[PDB]
Design a binder for this molecule. Structure first.
Ligand SMILES: C[C@@H]1CNc2c(cccc2S(=O)(=O)N[C@@H](CCCNC(=N)N)C(=O)N2CC[C@@H](C)C[C@@H]2C(=O)O)C1
Ligand code: NA
Lengths: 29, 257
């Protein structure tokens, strides 16, 4: 499924943005 | 966007500014889904009650943007539009059913650190992501607080903004408005009994509602900023065009050009 959805400055570099932990907490909280 | 932080550089690289030519004006948000195609709301391009109807030489799209009090040289690329595709069954009369449009760029866009397409969901991804209590992400340069009249005005941010919103149960979506909802749309945002704020506002329409798959690490666009009553009102939720239910129409247009 293409190069879609994976960010060069983040996912490609193994880096997180400031607010994404909030989104992933929603799959648990 | 109400109650959001300033976005980081390349945080939402699929984000597209829809722009008017005559005169110079931001109209809506939008998203990059390939190199030739942009995903936006239909009401951004077509609204008869206000005599709104745009052609290809009236509009202009800007990808890879961050600021707005700045023209970002060698960072933002500006594409011209070739053709506009609006859903035939798009109801502008009542509820904005099938509020979805597609726009083929004249020339393909080169991908960089700041320009990169989002993924569109299928069945399995939709079933594991679209659940009430799950948080998605809305992006835009729209107003920060509820405006008095029904479009873009004074109260803009200088930089792209980002907010995270929980998906809401259908019954609550329905009981939040007298407007007759459909299944081609979902609603998102916090409840009175939740004490966290945020909503899309004017100038954000068309922009993406995205979610990151916890398994495969890819970002998927589950929604398009469509409509709401006010901005960030208690007991009100923003309604987003259900992107998967309309993946059948999108697949048709892209494959038929
Ligand atoms: C089925 C919609 C419901 N609402 C409205 C309609 C028509 C005129 C004005 C409104 S509004 O100002 O109450 N709400 C705006 C603002 C909503 C923004 N807030 C969100 N939480 N998303 C709106 O829906 N729209 C969508 C239709 C366009 C034409 C105007 C305006 C917008 O610019 O977003 C029909
Ligand atoms: Na709300």
């Amino acid at each position: 499924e293409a190069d879609c959805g994976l960010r060069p400055l983040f996912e490609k570099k193994s880096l997180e943005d400031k607010t994404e932990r909030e989104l992933l907490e929603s799959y648990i909280d | 966007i109400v109650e959001g932080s300033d976005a980081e550089i390349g945080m939402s690289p699929w984000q597209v500014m829809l722009f008017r030519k005559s005169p110079q004006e931001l109209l809506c948000g939008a998203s990059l889904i390939s190199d030739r195609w942009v995903l936006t709301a239909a009401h951004c391009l077509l609204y008869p009650p206000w005599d709104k109807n745009f052609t290809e030489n009236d509009l202009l799209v800007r990808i890879g943007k961050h600021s707005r009090t700045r023209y970002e040289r060698n960072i933002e690329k500006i594409s011209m539009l070739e053709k506009i595709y609006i859903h035939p069954r798009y109801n502008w009369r009542e509820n904005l059913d099938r509020d979805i449009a597609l726009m083929k760029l004249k020339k393909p866009v080169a991908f960089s650190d700041y320009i990169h397409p989002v993924c569109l969901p299928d069945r399995e991804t939709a079933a594991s992501l679209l659940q009430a209590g799950y948080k998605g992400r809305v992006t835009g340069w729209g107003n920060l607080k509820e405006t008095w009249t029904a479009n873009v005005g004074k109260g803009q941010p200088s930089v792209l903004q980002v907010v995270n919103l929980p998906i809401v149960e259908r019954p609550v979506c329905k009981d939040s408005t007298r407007i007759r909802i459909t299944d081609n749309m979902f609603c998102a945002g916090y409840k009175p009994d939740e004490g966290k704020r945020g909503d899309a506002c004017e100038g954000d329409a068309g922009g993406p509602f995205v979610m990151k798959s916890p398994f495969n690490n890819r970002w998927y666009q589950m929604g398009i900023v469509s409509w709401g009553e006010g901005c960030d009102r208690d007991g009100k939720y923003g309604f987003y065009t259900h992107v998967f239910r309309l993946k059948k129409w999108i697949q048709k247009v892209i494959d038929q050009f």
